[PDB]
Structure formats: structure tokens, C-alpha cells
Symmetry: C3
Subunit: 592 residues, 3 copies
RNA sequence: CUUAGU
């Protein structure tokens, strides 16, 4: 408390009858060399450091923002010797990769576009109670450190985990608290004009959802999910206020923006030169809506303008290419906003061509093949004795994982050559999403005493293959003979929000309009603004992944999008149930 | 059902042992890939082979970048993986061996100078516990590459044939192998209705000794030739099943997109180099001196590079490659006509050979083997039975009593490389050496130990696997394991071409084969087909063959095999005069019984 | 048969280390038999039972993109040398062990400065452990073999390097002790040097006090003080002379294994012209810039200099901006050095013996078994010790005598410590070496199993670093151990010093004698290391030194200056020890979350 | 581009 150590900002989370959680941020004492260094405390016991740093020299070879987030769950935080044969913390665990995914998802859009300086966020778990979780605290600490560092960060992201306990949404729940919860949610957001804007949502139904609902609780409907989105807003607001608002943490030091280079693809010359002689050339180039005929105009005009523009922009082919891509993106976005028609030629509620075959791989305990248009996932599930379940050791409360879901994404799925080996971060994230989707419906260990492993091999991809993996995995589980509570489905979804000028209504006044469309394609993911994946049974939503940058959407449109999600998931459920309705007889490997 | 399956069937007849069937399906799984084939065997084995091509060539790479990866997914065996992470990570040894088996015949079939990156990912979906999949992987990879619209030469079907009771049964199970004496994985293609063998991998089973004495005929090289002749109908059937109709466009595929080629010396540097640097190469080759050869050949290379560096600028690599090609052509001509080797040795002459025993102190067994520049230090250690490798995979083997580890440090050939995890080359070489040494091993009941034979290549000139076999058997004799019979090895090979003479009014183009012994890196670069043979004085234990020829009659195959046997016999005599009998156990080694 | 009665290119040489009463050792170098294809190959035997191979190879074309010398050292400690199959599930020699990494570090420390400066060819030295006594060590024999092989390779590597391991028992300094002898010893000293003018010119030495140092000292043995350390430095000189003469007997250009040396291109930084221009046009202003002494003024002046002299010179020497930067930093280092020799002033504005801003906080991290935070100057090191049941030791297996590391120190160096960015993954060689140094500094003062039956793991994360953080890690580990309540024999503190030696011409006698003067300074910094002609770090308790490191370049120093530097080390360590004792001095009660075995 | 929680 001598100097630079008195920042000492504090925020409070009032859960009502469940006590108050005291989040605390301090700086200026640890890691003075880093650009930003914030130590975050939860209930004066869970202490973790977050240090953000930036490379001195600008990078030009890289074509994308090289943000890297590493969390390091050092084992001494749990008061135990590491279980590795070398007694050292080796490669990051599955929880420590999900945590940095959760940090990266909202933080990456919060950096200004065109940034090409390496930004590394190291989140070290220096201490942690055996009954608390650090991922949300990791989000808060990383955002606070980046805000302190003076990097071109946006408003300080704030995250909170909220759980439905007997009707109320409790923020930052203890593991024992969420044990009795019925819906786990992680919400990360920022304040824009005095109200919070939702940036990232990660929702998983608790493994005891069925028992709690049968015992008297209420199932997590989409309306409940929207109410919960509205419930965690004050917590995110309070956590954001504890970063810079009122001369605290980053507010004590002020931290005005420091210089940093930006490398945009099209400043003013190439963009104008393509917009002048390209805007009128896309009047009706997407009318057929087919891979065989519609593309024949857009690709041909792309080649024509590429040849024509090669007269003053010598050596800037990437610039004109990016400008053309942005032009066609904006044009087709306007197409959806006005005509209400998609690039693929389908409507906003048109589910892609569905098919689901069961037991296609012999000698396997369970096999299924689920196809949605271009997308196609083969799921294989196998069962062995209880001792074969993974013995997970980590800072996390769990000790044994009896249901493993591994999502394999070989490079031939998209038709391009790559490297087969250790899966990247995104594959682990997709596998975790599918596993969280399938946990709440699995039978209990005593009822069904078999460890479950599920390999989901993506044999064909057109973007957002996790939900098809969920459907294929539940099909395969039904094939293998496991008794589920209810079949599950899942589907991705897009929401395009934009301000369009209307002339008929009074005069030429700009109004903001939203279009919610189903079955996001590979190129439709970049074509919207709020892209979210919803999975569940016909009774409740289990897995919900949401990531956006919009400055808030009304509850009405969010409820409508979730209702459309329920409808489409019901259609997928019907197409799954027609092929297989009951679990089949177990494979000959089943003991008597 | 849904149309678009395009099944094709091949029948493998085995007489009294039972007919098997191979099925090919396409257009159903992994459509987004350039080519995909789901291969079925016996209605219970399925594996998906998919090949893709990079949309842009890798102009930076100096070699054709083909990568074959096999994913032997553990769920095929109906068991959660035993790894602590419950996931299948690094490939096992069997996956690497299957990758080598697929790569070896399939690599040369692509056009020379191709620069696209191509990856063949063969996934093992379902597998019967008693059936093998590597040869089925060869078939599926060849079929998928054929349907992918790639510059593939042709279907490369293959078959595993085992010799049981004088009948060469194709595609045997694991159960039938214990009743067999020789394993022949043969992969080849048909050219004008006759198969042209591409690769051969031959292993004598671990019960060959106990069955040859029991009545079965020994795997003598004549029996080996009979087996290589026996697999031809199976190769033809599998190749025509992979081909069937036009298939690539008539049945399943895509309209062809041309793939660019990057020849090293197209037509400019080669013509000038041949026109201006022909006679000097002949004079240098006919100088008749090994030690004086370099002062002429390197000087000619330098002066040719200097003189030609006036018309061609920036093509120094091209003129160097053209000069190498010219030297290759004249060296092949010299071997065919003048019947001389660049070493100055005869076509049946082994290099300076020597074998020392007990060189490394405080080791359970050690030996050193030298052949000219090749020098291998093989160390074997004897530990308890419990210390055998507990290998678990899709393969039916659940342990490994004898493990051969082939270390190839970068200083073996003077290169400053990277020391660390072994590559695929050394895994394959170690597997070949272990397959050579397995048949002559003592029984586990009579001799209850786990053997870990390390072969460290201390000096290399290419083809050091068979020398590793010799050093391994020497060190095994030194350690004290009772060998069934000493086993040697040799790196054989031959040059095959055509020579035209006017002795019968021109047009007399005779196909000449010359078999030369103790090949080197240069000899590998010159020889058309190079093979390695290992075995005892009675029968052969290991045989590796890799070729590209359109056909060789049984006369030259028998002659080359017999010459290989003679070389093996001489090397065996030298090893015997080094050490003869299993001596006493080393004092440091433990005694359990 | 043996070697078929020599009669070949195989050449043999032997060196007899006359131990005295305890024994006598024989180190034999042989060449020409194994690994003929390598540039150089030497097989080294010790006691006719410890045989290893050393092969040195060089590339045929220098690698241009590397701005430094790309030397690689690999200690392939093959498992069959110990007569046991590896315990790995794959039954193969996997990643290099910790002791193998330490052996590569020991070989690399003196070898790297021996090669001619500016070399770009990739030099790989591979030492393979073929045989080993079950009670003998190999790292010293490994550096001997590596030096011999590099000498036989014909490389511009200058001077055979000898290495000895001297340990003292009951006042007698033996060379190459057996594991039992080092068990009975009270100080071990791995030394390495070269012969310059008929006398050894010491180059590297790492010193560790054995595990039973306190009991041996209380048993009557002389404690390993600074005088004893200097005596050990002096006793290893004849052994280095013998082990260098033996490798020199493999003569060059005389029909022996010494081959002719072919042209070996060397890439310099500032060869002959840019340096002259920089030292002519930017010498007076650069020298006058050091008069103020204000650290902020140093940056304010050096930024202007590096921005304006480059632009001024970027008119005649074009395309060599990095070269002129190299010349500028060389000039700055030279003027700083001459200032240090002349008026005893550092770049930090402190005096020769001025210690940094000491701070030591205890019990920083809550819920941990023990935590401490040590801040020396800008360096800030956090150390967390985790007590646990003895079943959680390290059940390592290797050729070395040890079988279980009861106390394990892990030194984490995240990339944000220095402000730059990187990858937080596997620990590099440097982190392994620093952790080993800290662990060896802490072993002599650790309680035995019977008194405190718990495995001890120390986790020292460098939260902020400015070079020479190993000793800060030692102090922080001691503080954290005291916090956790482990009964220590006595607190141990470390400190990293420097030494700058140069020559000036005294003309007072109108004769102008070129005399070499020495200045010893404490609390070395990140930038002062690049100026110092010698760098060392000393760690000790209140009484005796428990760890030592030395990596020099001078061709020998008098014992007077060495004793003075060691006394300076004692003074700095005593001040630091007083600071820590003020922070905490006694073993307090264990944290409730610690297991009570 | 990299090698131990079997």
C-alpha cells in the first residue's frame, strides 16, 4: 500500500439469500514489466494473475490478428503435487483450453480491426478454492489487464456465471450451488450507452436437469433462457464499472490510447475504384440460387473486374480482392434485408436436406451417419467397464469423466489437404459443446454401468458441424442401446442486423431491421451479426453457444429467434425419430 | 434405398481354405474430398480411404510432397483407448508400417515433377480381430486415388499371400498365419493384362523352423519365386475390380482439372549438357581408377557449369540436375556394356567386410559390423520377461518379446541433422530387421527373456538395414541367446534396360538385366529395381523389393536371388569365423531360472 | 582379438590422474575406429569400464539467416549403457532427461566461447553414452570427449578443453570421485579450462555442496568457505593440465588424427570500415553523454544518438543499418567498460558494492502451502512451495546414481517477465539449468526424510526479470520454505556478481607499462552482463557457500582478486540474509491445508 | 516445425 499498489478496486455481486461474492482487482504490485498486470481475487481466497503484453515490432507477414491467450492452471493452486511422471505441469488440459477459448471469443472482436501486433494474455491461476471455478474470473482478469495495458481495447468486458437455483439466477455460483442448479450460463458483455450489451453466451444444462424438473423445478425453456440473458446484465454492469468508470483500476491511471499501427485492406482508393464499377454489376447475379448456374455470373464478373482493375493497382491484388469480397458481402446482406431471400436460394426457415442412417459400421457398439446438405457426420460410440472412464486430474472439481466425446475433423472433410494429428483448439471446443449437450440426458452410472466414448468424425463440412455432430452422436447412442431420457437435436442459426432506409414509411428514414435465418452455411457465418447454436430435446434447451458484437438486441427478437430454433430443432428431432425410435438390442459385446 | 453407391466386387479364391470377397463403395462417404472409397472385406471389415489435392502447387518444395496417413481409430477394435487421455494420439508402429506399405508403390505412380501437395488419409472404421488391414489399405488408397482425378499411373492393387502346405492362400487371417511359413505382401499393377509387381515385403513366420522340420518345405528362393508368381491372379482381380469400367468419369469422380508439372531439366539445359559434355564423362568412367575418379568428375562438373553459365542465367540448379542425369545415363550404359561398377568391384564382389564382437564393455551383448564405409554398432540387452513391450492397438499382437530399435544419428553420413524422435524411415528399417531376426529366436519357455536390440548406425553409405541385421545376430550370439541359426543379410539390386545393336540389321533391341551386389546410395540412384534379402544358410527370413519395371522374367529373378544367396553365404561364413556359438551369459545379465 | 593389434589409423592416448591415497584414474582417448564418417570422432574410456563416443560435425554451407553461432550439443544417454530396458511404455529413449540437459549445458558453457567469433556454420556435437559404471558419473568425461572430438575435426575451434570434477574429502581434493566418495565429500567442483602459456586458463566451473555438508562439517571436516573454494580451484589446475595435454598429443599436421583445416568462412558484424567511422564521428559526444549519470537521461540521449548518427551515416554505407547499430552498441559497451575501470561508476548510477532495492514479502499467495515474493531491484520473483506426502516424489530412472528426487525445484520464466512475447510451453534449456542451480543451492540446508517426511516442490515463477534471476529464485525459495514451515538448517541467500578486467598504459615512469586492472561489482544487471569480462553467481548460508557458478573469458586471474570477489560475495549475501531474516527467520507453523504425515 | 501422465 506504499505506491502504485492502492488501485485496489472492488466489486460486489449480491445473490440475495446465497450471500455476496466480493470480486477484487489490484495492480502495480505483481508483474510490473508487463504492459498490463491485474491480480483478481474472488471471496479473498481465489487469487489469479493476468498479464497482457504486446510485441514491440509490428508484424506484416501475418494476415490475421495474432492474439494468443494462454491460461496456466499451475497445480500448486490446488495444494497437490502434479500427477505427471515428471511431476510438472505439461500441456494444457481440456479445462484450460476451454477457458482460453471462452476468453478469446469476446475479447477478439473487442480489438480494433487491422491490428497486426502480437498480443499475448497469460492468465496464471495462483490460487483457487476446491469449490470454485476460474474461467469467468479469467475473463474478467484478462479484460481488466488489457484495459490497463493501454492497448486499443474496447470497453472492458465483464463476465459472470449465472445459474437457475429454484427460480432465481445466482451469479458466480459455488460448485455445490450449481449442483442444485438447473441451467448453467456464462455471459460476457460490455456497456455501450449506460446499458449492457451481450457479447458471448455459453449455456449448458446441469447433469441433474431431469431429476430437478421431475422433482418440482421448471425446465429451461427458451423464455427462461431469455429471462436469464436479462438476469446477468446487472452483474456484468457492476463488473464493468469496477474497471475504469469511476477512477478505479484503469480509472486511477486514466490510460489514454497509445499509438499502434493498423493495416486495413482497403482504405479509400481500391474501395472506391471497385465500388464505382462494381455496385451496379450485382443487380440480379444471385437469382438462380444454385451452385451450377447462379455462381456462373458472380464468378465471371469477379474475373472481369479483376482483369479490368489491373491497370493502376499493380501489386495490390489482395487489396482489390478484399474490397470485392466486402462489396459482395454488403450487397448480399442488403439482399437479405430487403428481398428477404438468401444466397443459397432458401428461406429463413428452410432446414437443409436431412437424412439420418443408423448402424452403418459393423462390429462397432453404435454407429450413425447424419447428413444435412453438404454437412455429414459419422458418429461411433463404444462401451467398456467403469474402470475405463477417464481419470481427469486438474483444478476442476470433477475427478472422473464417464462420458468422453472426441470430435475429429480430418482435413478431407472440407476437401483441402492439411495435417492430421493433435486436434486444434476449435475441435476441443466443438467436442466440449457436444459433450455438454449430451450430458443432461445420459442415464445415471448405477442405472447404466458402462463408460461411454463417442468419436464424431466429420466426413463432410460446410460450417457449424458441431450441431450435426450432436445429432449424429445421439443417433449413435440410441443405436448402441443406451437408455436416454429423450432424444436430442441441435442446429446453428444466424441473425443479420442492419440499418436500412425506408422511403414508403413517411420519408427516407433509416430503421434498424433484423433477419433471423436457419441453418447457417459456411459462407453465411460471416454474412450475419449474431450467430448462435441451439441444441436440446423437445422439452428444454441443453447447449447454447452465442457470440456477437451487436450493441444489444430487443428481448422480442431474441425470443422469436429462440422460438424458430425450437421449431427447427423439432423438425430435426422428427427426422431423427422416423429412422430410429427406440434403443436397439445391445451389441454382442454386452455381458449377461 | 438411395442410388449413388457404385459397388464393385472382387473374388479371392483360396481353394479349401475358403473364398473371400473385396467390395468397393464410392459416392456415399466423404463427398467433399477429391476422391473417396469405402473398402469392405468379408462383410465385416470396413475402412475409408480418402485422397485430396492442394488447390495450389508447392513450388517451394524440392520433392513431390505426398503424405500417406492411416488413422487406426481404436473404436474399430471395440475398446476405449488405454491411454491416460483416452484418445489416440501419435501413430503406433503398425500405422507407420502401413503408411510405408501404401507409400512405397503408390509414390512412383505419380508423374515425375508433380508439385501439388497430396494427402491420403486412410481411416480404419471396423476391423475383425482376426484379419489384417494393411494390404486392404493399399487397395483402398489406390482406388481412392484413381477416382480422385489425379495424375495417377494406374490401380496398384495388392494382396497378402501366405504359404500353407504348398498352397499360396491369398488374404489369410491371423489364425491361418500360424499354420503358414511365409508371408508375401505383394502390390502391383497390370499393364497389358499381365501384372507388373511394384513392391514385395516378405517375412518368414515365427514358426518357420518348427514347421520346416515338421514336413513343410523351407522358404527357399525358388519357393519365394513361386509365391511371387502365385499372387499374380489376385493382383489382376483386385486391379480390375479397382478399375472396373471407366469409373473415374463413367461411374464416380469429377471432370478433370489439369495439375501443373515442374520438371527439373525440361529441354534446354539437358540438350546442351548432353551435346557438350558426353565424351569427357566416358573418358572419366573408363579411367579405371576409384581414387582418381573424383579429380576428373568434379572438375568436369565445375567446368561444364562455368562454360554453360553464359546462355542460361539463373539455371545453375537446372544445369546441375541435367549433368546428374547425363552421368546417370552414361553410368547405366557403362554397367550394361562394360560390366563395371563405379566402386571398381565385380558384380558379385562384396566390399571390405569385417565383424568384431564384444566391443562395448559392461553391456549384455555388443557387436560391430563394417562393410566398406557402412559401420553398425549393435547392442543387445537382456532384461526380465515383464519388461517386454505391452503394445496395444488394432493389431492382434498384444506384446513384443523382441524389439529392434534402429538409431540413425546424423553423424552417420556426416550431416548435421536433428537428434530426437525417430522418423518413419528408421521405424521401417527397425521393423525389417526385427522381422528378419524373429524366426531364428529361442522359444519363450526354453529362454524366458525380453530382448531389446539396439542398432546404432555409426557410419553410412546407404542401405544399412541388412548390415544392422548382421550386427544384430552377431550381438545376439555374443549376449548368449541360443540362435536357431545365424542369419545374414545383403542389399542386392540390378540395372535393367534395352540395348540396340546392328548385328542383325538394326532394330535389335535386347532387354538386358545386370545384377550387382553391395549397392550404395549411388547404386540406388542408378539401379532400376533394388531389393534386400536376408536369411540363414538354409532359408530366407526377410525380403524387401521395390521396383517400377513393367516386367522381369523368372530367369533373372532366380539368378539374382541365387547370387543374393551366395553373398549371404559368404557373409555368414565371415560372421561364423567371428563368433560361432552362443557363449556364456554376461555377468551383469540376470538369471531368473 | 581385441583391436587386431592396432596397426591402423586408430590412435590412443592416456592421461593418468594421480589421486593419491584414495586411488588413481586413467582417462583414455581413442580415435580412428568408430564413426569414421563424422568430421571428428573420439571414444573416451575411464577406468576401462566407462566408455562413451563423441562425434563433432559441421555443415558444408553456413546458414545465413541466423544472427548468432548455431552450435548444438546432444547428450544421447542410451539406456543400454545401464543394462536396463527403458521403463517407458514405448520402451525407447524418449525426450532427454534433466541430467542429460544439464550435461549439455555443462559441455556448452566453455565450448561456446572457444569457437571463433562470427562463425555461422552449424556445428553439432553428439556424445553417446555407450557404457557406464553403476557408481560413476559421465558429464566431466563427456566434456573431455566433446573437446577432443572437436579438436580432431579441424574446425576453427581453438584450444583443447580439459574438464575435471574435484571433490574434497577430509581436506584432500580428489579428481573424478566415485559416487561413494562424493557421498563422503563436503564440496564438489566441476571445473573446465584450457592451457594458454604452459598454465591453465580457467573457463567454467559449477560448484555444489553435497547433501550431507552440515553433518560432515559438524563431524570435523573443514567447511566449504571461500578460502576452501579457492583451494579447490587451485587443486584442479594439474588435472586440467593433464587432461588437456592428453588431448593435445593427438597432434595435427604430423601424421596423427589431426587433419588439415579447410577454409571456414566467418561472418562478422562490423568488420573494418563502419566501426572506424562510428568510432571517429561518434566518440566524443558518446563519451560526454555518460557524464550526467541520470538513468532517464541515458535513455533520452541514447534514443537521440541511435536515431541521428544512423541517419548521418546513412549516406556512404547503405544497406547496413543493422551493422551501424552493432558498431554503436559496441562503442557504448567499450566506453562503459573504460568508465568502470577508470572512475568506478556503473550504468545504474550505483557504486561498485552497492546492492539493489531489497524487498522480501512472505505469505503472498493465499491457500498455498508456502508462498514468498522477493524483489531485488526491478527483479520480482514469486516462489510457491507445496508440501505433500512422500509418495509424490519423482520416481526417475536413468544412468545416474539417483533414483528419487525428493526435493524438486521448477523455475518458470513466462515471456511477460521481460516485457516481450513468446510461447508458454515446454521449459527451455536455460530454465532447466536455472532450476537445477537453485535446487543444488537449496539441497545442503534441507531437512532429512526422518525429521520432515514430506516431498518438497518449489515453483519459482519469474514475474519480472532483468537478468541473473537464479539467485533471486534461491532467496525466494528459501523464504517460501521458511513460510511453509520446513525446518531449515540455516537460511541461504544468493547473489550474482560480475568482474571487468582490462588494461591501461601507465606513462608516469615515461615507460608506459600496460597493466591489467580488475573491478568487481555486485548485483549484476541485464546490460552489465554484456560488458563484464567475467560473470559468476555465489549462493551460500551464513557460514558456507552451498552453490557456485563461473563462466569466464580471461586467461587466468590471480588468487588475490578471486578471494576479494568471494569476500564481496560473502558481504552481499550477509546483507541479503539479514533482510530476509527481518522478513522471516524461523520455521513457523504449517498451513492447515498441508497434509500431516 | 518439437519428443512421457499408459
Amino acid at each position: 500500500e506504499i505506491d502504485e499498489g492502492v488501485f485496489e478496486t472492488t466489486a460486489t455481486i449480491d445473490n440475495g439469500s446465497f450471500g455476496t461474492r466480493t470480486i477484487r482487482f489490484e495492480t502495480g504490485r505483481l508483474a510490473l514489466q508487463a504492459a498490463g498486470a491485474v491480480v483478481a481475487y474472488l471471496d479473498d481466497d481465489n487469487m489469479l494473475l493476468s498479464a497482457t503484453t504486446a510485441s514491440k515490432n509490428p508484424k506484416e507477414h501475418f494476415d490475421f490478428f495474432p492474439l494468443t491467450v494462454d491460461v496456466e492452471e499451475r497445480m500448486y493452486a490446488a495444494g497437490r503435487i502434479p500427477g505427471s511422471f515428471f511431476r510438472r505441469e505439461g500441456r494444457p488440459s481440456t479445462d484450460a483450453i476451454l477457458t482460453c477459448r471462452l476468453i478469446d471469443r469476446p475479447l477478439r472482436p473487442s480489438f480494433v480491426d487491422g491490428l497486426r501486433n502480437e498480443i499475448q494474455i497469460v492468465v496464471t491461476i495462483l490460487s483457487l478454492d476446491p469449490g470454485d471455478l476460474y474461467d469467468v474470473l479469467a475473463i474478467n482478469a484478462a479484460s481488466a489487464s488489457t484495459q490497463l495495458g493501454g492497448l486499443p481495447f474496447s470497453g472492458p468486458i465483464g463476465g459472470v456465471r449465472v445459474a437457475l437455483i429454484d427460480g432465481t439466477w445466482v451469479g458466480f455460483p459455488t460448485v455445490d450451488q450449481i449442483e442444485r442448479a438447473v441451467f448453467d450460463m456464462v455471459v460476457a458483455g460490455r456497456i455501450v450507452e449506460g446499458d449492457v450489451a451481450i457479447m458471448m453466451v455459453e449455456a449448458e444444462a446441469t447433469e441433474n436437469v431431469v431429476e430437478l424438473v421431475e422433482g418440482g423445478a421448471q425446465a429451461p425453456t427458451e423464455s427462461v433462457v431469455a429471462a436469464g440473458l436479462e438476469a446477468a446484465k446487472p452483474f456484468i454492469a457492476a463488473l464493468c464499472t469496477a474497471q475504469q468508470e469511476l477512477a478505479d483500476a484503469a480509472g486511477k491511471s486514466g490510460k489514454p490510447t497509445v499509438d499502434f499501427p493498423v493495416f486495413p485492406d482497403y482504405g479509400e482508393d481500391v474501395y472506391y475504384s471497385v465500388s464505382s464499377v462494381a455496385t451496379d454489376e450485382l443487380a440480379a447475379a444471385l437469382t438462380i440460387g444454385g451452385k451450377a448456374e447462379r455462381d456462373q455470373r458472380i464468378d465471371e464478373i469477379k474475373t472481369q473486374v479483376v482483369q479490368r482493375l489491373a491497370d493502376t493497382y499493380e501489386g495490390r491484388e489482395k487489396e482489390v480482392g478484399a474490397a470485392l469480397r466486402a462489396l459482395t458481402k454488403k450487397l448480399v446482406r442488403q439482399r437479405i434485408l430487403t428481398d428477404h431471400f438468401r444466397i443459397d436460394g432458401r428461406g429463413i426457415t428452410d432446414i437443409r436436406a436431412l437424412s439420418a442412417e443408423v448402424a452403418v459400421v459393423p462390429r462397432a457398439h453404435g454407429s450413425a451417419l447424419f447428413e444435412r446438405g453438404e454437412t455429414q457426420i459419422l458418429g461411433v460410440t463404444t462401451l467398456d467397464m467403469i474402470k475405463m472412464a477417464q481419470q481427469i486430474d486438474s483444478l476442476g472439481p470433477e475427478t472422473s469423466k464417464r462420458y468422453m466425446h472426441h470430435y475429429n475433423f480430418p482435413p478431407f472433410s472440407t476437401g483441402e489437404t492439411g495435417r492430421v494429428g493433435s486436434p486444434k483448439r476449435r475441435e476441443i471446443g466443438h467436442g466440449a459443446l457436444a459433450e455438454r449437450a449430451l450430458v443432461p440426458v445420459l442415464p445415471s452410472v448405477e442405472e447404466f454401468p458402462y463408460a461411454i466414448r463417442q468419436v464424431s468424425e466429420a466426413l463432410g463440412s460446410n460450417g457449424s458441424t458441431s450441431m450435426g455432430s450432436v445429432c449424429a452422436s445421439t443417433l449413435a447412442l440410441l443405436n448402441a442401446g443406451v437408455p436416454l431420457k429423450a432424444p436430442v437435436a441441435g442446429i446453428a442459426m444466424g441473425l443479420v442486423s442492419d440499418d436500412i432506409q425506408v422511403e414508403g414509411a413517411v420519408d427516407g428514414v433509416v430503421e434498424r431491421r433484423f433477419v433471423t435465418l436457419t441453418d447457417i452455411l459456411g459462407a453465411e457465418d460471416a454474412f450475419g451479426d449474431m450467430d448462435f447454436k441451439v441444441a436440446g430435446t423437445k422439452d428444454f434447451v441443453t447447449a447454447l453457444q452465442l457470440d456477437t458484437k451487436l450493441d444489444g438486441i430487443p428481448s422480442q427478437v431474441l425470443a422469436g429467434a429462440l422460438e424458430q430454433a425450437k421449431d427447427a430443432r423439432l423438425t430435426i428431432l422428427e427426422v431423427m425419430a422416423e429412422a430410429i425410435d427406440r434403443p436397439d438390442e445391445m451389441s454382442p459385446y454386452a455381458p449377461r
